[PDB]
Structure 1
Amino acid sequence: MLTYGAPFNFPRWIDEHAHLLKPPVGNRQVWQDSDFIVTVVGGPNHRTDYHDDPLEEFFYQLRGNAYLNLWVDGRRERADLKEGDIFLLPPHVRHSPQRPEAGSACLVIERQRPAGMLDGFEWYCDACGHLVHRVEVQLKSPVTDLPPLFESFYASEDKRRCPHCGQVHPGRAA
């Protein structure tokens, strides 16, 4: 009844999955079907989407450095994840992880969302900072649910169009 198997060496697991912790995959979930969602996120990767997680998110930047673009108290801000840092993000704080370094690795821990508790993915205008587009999602399989979501934003000049100042958001890369 050890449903998720025996203990195992983490650094070797990370080493062994180096090829997955780089584009295009980027990340790898450690156990499947668990309530705790346990993921290692490599790099490099940059993104323009901001995440609205209705639950907490735990980070431990095991290797290399990264940072989180955030919206804290109405202002754009940056939290660094230097190698060795840990950090706990409160529910709903908008965050956009940037991971510039190859070979970096970050332990990220989350919980499954109950039915009816949704995640938000959002984009903001570089020009005036207004919200450009939000999609909410019952997030069961990030790996497969999120790329079509992001993909549809990039493809729609409409979705990318700031309702405040008309600036068309750049889409994929800032």
Structure 2
Amino acid sequence: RHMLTYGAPFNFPRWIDEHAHLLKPPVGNRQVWQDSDFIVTVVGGPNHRTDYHDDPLEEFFYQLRGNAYLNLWVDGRRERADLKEGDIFLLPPHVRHSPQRPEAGSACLVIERQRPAGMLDGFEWYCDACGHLVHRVEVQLKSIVTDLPPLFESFYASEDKRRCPHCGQVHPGRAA
């Protein structure tokens, strides 16, 4: 039996309202419950990003407020999947995805799983000129909010990491 480790139910719209100032730059996402198997986050905007995420497990999306879209690699081709207000979406493992969240006040429920030891997440960048993989970092992810920054920053700070090994074009880095 036992204890309601994660607290009682609570009103989600009110919660999103009250954390609105973190669903903006420079924070943008916010985890609901700590130390749980289900990683439950609300992601706001605006945030554009240049990395593609390779998640070894599924990701559930429910775009509660406003609109966003996912840049994908599907079947070897760049595709866009729109997250219009009201949309839900389940992403299979390892589909590369780059969330674009251009609207302020937007809010997306994203649910993922804690990765077991040895199951790594990948973060990738691709050449705008030729489309080859430019750089990949693999990470044992412990914090969907926190392990990402230093990894993006070390890509941004390194012309070496950003240099396409197929055509030599140096990826632009922080912004597309």
Normalized against structure 2, the TM-score is what? 0.98
What's the Cα RMSD here?
Answer: 0.4
Quote the sequence identity (%).
99
- 1:42-71 per-position Cα deviation (integer Å, ceiling 9, x unaligned): 000000000000000000000000000000
Q: Could you say what secondary structure the match of 1:67 adopts? A: strand
Distance 2:16 2:132 in 1: 39
Deviates more, 1:138-147 or 1:52-61: 138-147
Q: Distance in 1 between matches of 2:118 and 2:45?
A: 32
Residue 30 of structure 1: CA displacement? 0.3
User: What number of residue pairs does the alignment pair up?
Assistant: 174
Write out the 4+ residue segments of structure 1 that deviate beyond 2 Å after TM superposition.
none
1:23 aligned partner:
25
Deviation, 1:141, is: 1.3
Distance in 2, matches of 1:7 and 1:21, equals: 21
Tell me how far apart the structure 1 counterparts of residues 65 and 119 of structure 2 sit (CA, whole Å). Answer: 32
Which ranges in structure 2 are unaligned for 5 or more consecutive residues? none
Distance 2:45 2:79 in 1: 21
Secondary structure in 2 aligned to 1:143?
Answer: coil
2 CA distance for matches of 1:25 and 1:74? 32
2:127 to 125, 128, 150: 125
Q: 2:31·2:145 contact (CA, 8 Å) conserved in 1?
A: no
Post-superposition offset of 1:142: 2.6
Aligned counterparts of 2:67 and 2:146: Cα–Cα separation in 1? 26
CA distance in 2, matches of 1:167, 1:8: 50
Q: Distance in 2 between matches of 1:86 and 1:15?
A: 21
- Secondary structure of 1:151 counterpart: helix
Q: Aligned-pair distance for 1:144?
A: 2.2
Q: What residue number does 1:169 align with?
A: 171
Q: Is there any run of 5+ residues in structure 1 with no aligned partner, and where? A: none
